[PDB]
Design a protein around this nucleic acid. Structure first.
Length: 90
RNA sequence: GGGAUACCAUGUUCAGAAGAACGUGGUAUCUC
C-alpha cells in the first residue's frame, strides 16, 4: 500500500537526497487528557509536504509521511530539482 | 483485568526497491 513503511521509503528512498533538509516537526504535544498529536511534514525550513494528526500520535507520524508522498507533483518536482540544483547553495 | 500518552533505560521490527521507524521493560496520569 502507501503508509509508514511505504512512506519512509518514499520520503528518503524516493526523495531522500543530500541537503534536502527534511523537517518533520511535532506539534500539539500529546497528553493523558487528549493524546492527539499533529505532525508537520516540512523541509528546507519553508516547504510543507503535508500534515498529519492521530490519537496515538503514530497515525500522526505516519500520516505525516503519507502526507509527503501525497504530492506527486511536489515529489517528482524534487526529483528534477535534486538533479538541477545550481551552485552557491547553503 | 483491557487500552493510551509519557519519563528512565534498551532493542527489535517493519520492509523486502529503499530505507525509516517503531518496539520492549517498569513507574505514573488518564481512561475503560
Amino acid at each position: 500500500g502507501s503508509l509508514d513503511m511505504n512512506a519512509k521509503r518514499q520520503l528518503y528512498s524516493l526523495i531522500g537526497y543530500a541537503s534536502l533538509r527534511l523537517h518533520y516537526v511535532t506539534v500539539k504535544k500529546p497528553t493523558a487528557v487528549d493524546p492527539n498529536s499533529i505532525v508537520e511534514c516540512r523541509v528546507g525550513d519553508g516547504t510543507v509536504l503535508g500534515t498529519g494528526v492521530g490519537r496515538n500520535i503514530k497515525i500522526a507520524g505516519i500520516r505525516a509521511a503519507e502526507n509527503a508522498l501525497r504530492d506527486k507533483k511536489m515529489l517528482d518536482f524534487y526529483a528534477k530539482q535534486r538533479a538541477a540544483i545550481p551552485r552557491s547553495e547553503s
